[PDB]
């Protein structure tokens, strides 16, 4: 499992020609702001690769 | 009809150590858990260990882990819970209830013995 | 993992007042959630247990539902009377360690 390459899976905000974005803020789907538990409905944005 | 009373609080400084005692009267006691539950003064509820049937599986929760040593007795049909190397933090109300199964809620609570670490 | 509660809400005698426990990383599906009840000065009572079933001497007024919607439980309080004025809890088995977590505590008033 190669763990230095990752990739966006999913965001909630359309990136435009020409745009990155290094934040790593956890997505959340539709619900109360998990403040970043990884619980209900709250994710990591990033996704590891192998 | 099933009684439950418990006795033997108190308050002492911290690093000693207590003992509290729960008896059963009213039902078999032999295929019932039994799980004591803490309330601090103004704090809501808490978990603090649970005993197998007969004595041998023990679960305590990491807050509580290793200075507390629950064992009961079907001899008798009683509950002991004797705490040591006590702190500040433990100030709470114990209580001791039956549990009808492990995945399900108590069905009979205690009374309440007001145990606080202050000397 | 903790049972998200408010601290205290209430409402006039007379209406249906609700009271949420939504857990914070364990599956709503995984055991059933239940409802205590303490008065002041006393020892806690169980009013609820399996989330569907009323125990032997509670009156038609308590009502456990299940929202999977957002992994929260509620309690419909049909006729919110002077004798509802106590403090309520939760209980879930949440958890792959062995231990159970208690709600947080709503301190129901009579706003009269």
């Known amino acids: 499992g190669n763990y230095n390459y990752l990739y966006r899976l999913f965001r909630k905000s359309n990136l435009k020609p020409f745009e990155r974005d290094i934040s790593t803020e956890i997505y959340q789907a539709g619900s109360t702001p998990c403040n970043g538990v990884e619980g209900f409905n709250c994710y990591f944005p990033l996704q590891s690769y192998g | 009809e099933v009684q439950l009373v418990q006795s033997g609080g108190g308050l002492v400084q911290p690093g000693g150590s207590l003992r509290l005692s729960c008896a059963a009267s009213?039902?078999?006691?032999?295929?019932?858990?039994m799980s004591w539950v803490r309330q601090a003064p103004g704090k809501g509820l808490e978990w603090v260990a649970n005993?197998?049937?007969?004595?041998?599986?023990?679960y305590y929760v990491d807050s509580v882990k290793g200075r507390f040593t629950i064992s009961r007795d079907n001899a008798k049909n009683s509950l002991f819970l004797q705490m040591n190397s006590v702190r500040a933090e433990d100030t709470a109300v114990y209580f001791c209830?039956?549990?009808?199964?492990?995945?399900?809620?108590?069905?009979?609570w205690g009374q309440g013995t007001l145990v606080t670490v202050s000397s | 993992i903790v049972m998200t509660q408010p601290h205290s809400v209430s409402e006039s005698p007379g209406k249906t007042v609700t009271i949420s426990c939504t857990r914070s990383?364990?599956?709503?599906?995984?055991?059933?959630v239940q409802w205590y009840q303490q008065r002041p000065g006393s020892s806690p009572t169980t009013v609820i247990y399996?989330?569907?079933?009323?125990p032997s001497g509670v009156p038609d007024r308590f009502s456990g539902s299940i929202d999977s919607s957002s992994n929260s439980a509620s309690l419909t309080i049909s006729g919110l009377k002077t004798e509802d004025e106590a403090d309520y809890y939760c209980?879930?088995?949440?958890?792959?360690?062995?231990?159970?977590?208690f709600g947080g505590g709503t301190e129901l008033t009579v706003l009269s």
């Open positions: 990383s364990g599956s709503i599906a995984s055991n059933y």
């Open positions: 005993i197998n049937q007969d004595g041998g599986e023990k």
């Open positions: 209980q879930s088995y949440d958890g792959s360690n062995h231990n159970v977590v």
């Open positions: 209830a039956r549990v009808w199964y492990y995945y399900g809620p108590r069905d009979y």
């Open positions: 399996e989330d569907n079933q009323r």
């Open positions: 009213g039902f078999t006691f032999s295929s019932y858990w």
